[PDB]
Amino acid sequence: GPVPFSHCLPTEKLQRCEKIGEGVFGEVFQTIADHTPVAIKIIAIEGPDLVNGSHQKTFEEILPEIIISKELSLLSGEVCNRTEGFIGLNSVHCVQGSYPPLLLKAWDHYNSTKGSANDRPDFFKDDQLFIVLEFEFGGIDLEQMRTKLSSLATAKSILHQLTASLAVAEASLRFEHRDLHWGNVLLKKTSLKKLHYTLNGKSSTIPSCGLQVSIIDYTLSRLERDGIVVFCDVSMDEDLFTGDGDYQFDIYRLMKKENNNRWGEYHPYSNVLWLHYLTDKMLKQMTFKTKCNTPAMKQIKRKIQEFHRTMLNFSSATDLLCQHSLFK
């Protein structure tokens, strides 16, 4: 049976919620428990009414994200294919009830300061079901860090972390993220100088430049275990492929070209397409506190430029990681 909101959000945890993100299908809050921040994603399910202008998803439609979130979180504890580059999953609950007034307070604060595209979630009845996903707090998204990074040396570490995590997930799970825009890449400070991963039993390190990258959001993702494929079939989607104004929206169309509109198949080239979009953001949208003012920094820039112009000739993140000169 479903649980009340108070089971996931006891009073102290609920009182410390602040809203951090939103989309058509739900709301993300940060809170604290045992002195540690966490992120809480809340999605209404199974009801007949519109929320933010769209129908609610069913439990069966949220299950792929839950499964993929768990599999990717578990990669931090694996041996042959190990990465911490995907967000940790702490818990998942099915909750029943009206929206907590304390979360409405947080929602209002966000609407007042940042502005929301969503309806104020005050209209849910006491029989409403929700999925509540509790994740590790992964830091701040790359888009919000557009003006906050030190230099292009940091951009290099970010790209290497992303490529390695995707390669590990390709090897372990035949994973494709499929929606790796810069709102779905998080950055957090670390005191570790090197980050560790293992790919098909071979362990390596990546210089951190003081940041640990976490990939989030598996709504469009695909993976498999023992021939059972978990994915989102967007072959008939009437809006996903008609965006404009950002290279992001071309990526959906380019994935559809690569896979012939057959989303169950494994096409790890989609990971390369996203990494190209991310590299493009680093070179064109990100603005750094210290620019490339020395010969050595102009060299790093030239290496990332060379990555941008060559990486689309690689077949997967694994091929990029193992063969591209940027990572030697």
């Binding site: 058509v24 933010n52 595209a117 969503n118 709102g183 996903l240 965006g243 950002d246 959906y252």
Partner: peptide
């Protein structure tokens, strides 16, 4: 940007 929007 989010992949889809109101």
């Amino acid at each position: 940007a989010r992949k889809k929007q109101t």
